[PDB]
């Protein structure tokens with residue numbers, strides 16, 4: 001019935017990948033209970049830091065990456081959802097289901113990566129567990145893992161960054177190419193698609 005139709009909650013920042021120092025490690029900033037509450041209200045007073053956020057809905061968890069003042073993530077994680085923020089839910093600034101890409105204004109306190117201009121093919125994928133995985137670029141939107149891994153190790157890292165040697169954003173992790181459950185290559189949204197959308 002119309003009176004009973006419910007609302008999907010907002011995406012919620014529940015942690016971050018710390019790349020500040022010499023060692024990368026994940027930090028959680030909100031537990032499940034607070035996450036559920038924050039997703040319903042859309043009101044998130046937590047301080048935000050860093051470039052790579054860990055984000056969750058009521059049913060999924062993935063990553064979000066700030067590039068040039070926009071917090072980017074994948075449509076198959078976020079859908080058309082708002083993101084929780086100190087002033088309430090924030091509507092998506094970008095939505096492209098054809099690229100599996102969405103974006104919101106980057107939260108106050110976040111740091112943005114700058115798009116890569118090096119043209120280098122030696123990349124590094126950052127996972128939700130703060131693993132930094134060497135990836136060789138194989139195409140506009142493909143890269144091969146130098147050391148293959150079960151897909152289990154990549155699950156939940158969509159929306160994370162592929163970086164160049166200089167630490168620039170090369171793309172947003174979108175999908176894993178696997179055979180027999182072993183991930184051999186990754187599919188990603190090139191940063192140029194982002195720069196075009198912007």
Ligand SMILES: COc1ccc2nc(C)c(O[C@@H]3C[C@H]4C(=O)N[C@]5(C(=O)NS(=O)(=O)C6(C)CC6)C[C@H]5/C=C\CCCCC[C@H](NC(=O)OC5CC(F)(F)C5)C(=O)N4C3)nc2c1
Nearest residue numbers: 060061062076077100151154155156157158174175176187
């Ligand atoms: C509904 O609207 C839309 C619109 C456009 C969409 N466009 C894409 C490409 C897509 O793909 C889905 C989701 C994605 C995925 O699971 N992404 C990662 C992830 O972690 N998600 S996640 O965080 O856990 C989660 C669900 C958000 C919470 C990183 C991968 C890690 C492990 C996956 C293993 C099993 C899956 C292997 C699979 N493989 C593959 O499809 O490869 C091919 C794409 C190609 F290049 F053509 C070849 C794969 O990767 N996906 C399947 N859904 C779309 C949906």
Ligand SMILES: [Zn+2]
Nearest residue numbers: 116118164168
């Ligand atoms: Zn670069």
